[PDB]
């Protein structure tokens, strides 16, 4: 996989954000990561962690992997990365997103994914408290 160069429009919620991407605004929904939706538990703080990472960031990162870019609401399917830090990888570590939405031909951080969730999990972090 390789990563491409965007930069951010605006923080949405856990796991949507959007971002301007070879010159046009577009929502991505990341890969292989479910976040609570904002009005569930963990919904307010996943919002919190993946605003003030990209938002924090100097530099954004859209990864897409081998399958389809686009899911069927027109949202973009990426790895997003924040100066270099994967922020999937990152909500999933902290308890904060679940591995999810395991699709065949988009799946390549799967197993990255699952063993930060059984981190996580571990440590009983977030949702997994
Ligand atoms: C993450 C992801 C979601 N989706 C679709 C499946 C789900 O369909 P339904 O809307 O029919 O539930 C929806 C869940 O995303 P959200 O968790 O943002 O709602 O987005 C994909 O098609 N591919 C993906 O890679
Ligand atoms: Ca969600």
Do not use: C
Not at 41 to 57: D, I, L, Q
């Amino acid at each position: 996989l390789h990563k491409e160069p965007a930069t951010l429009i605006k923080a949405i919620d856990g796991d949507t954000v959007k971002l301007m991407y070879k010159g046009q605004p577009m929502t991505f929904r990341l890969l292989l990561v479910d976040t609570p939706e904002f009005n569930e538990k963990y919904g307010p703080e996943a919002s919190a962690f993946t605003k003030k990472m990209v938002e924090n960031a100097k530099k954004i990162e859209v990864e897409f992997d081998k399958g389809q870019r686009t899911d069927k609401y027109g949202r973009g399917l990426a790895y997003i990365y924040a100066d270099g830090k994967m922020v999937n990888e990152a909500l999933v570590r902290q308890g904060l997103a679940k591995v999810a939405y395991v699709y065949k031909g988009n799946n390549t951080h799967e197993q990255l994914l699952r063993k930060a969730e059984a981190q996580a999990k571990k440590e009983k972090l977030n949702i997994w408290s």
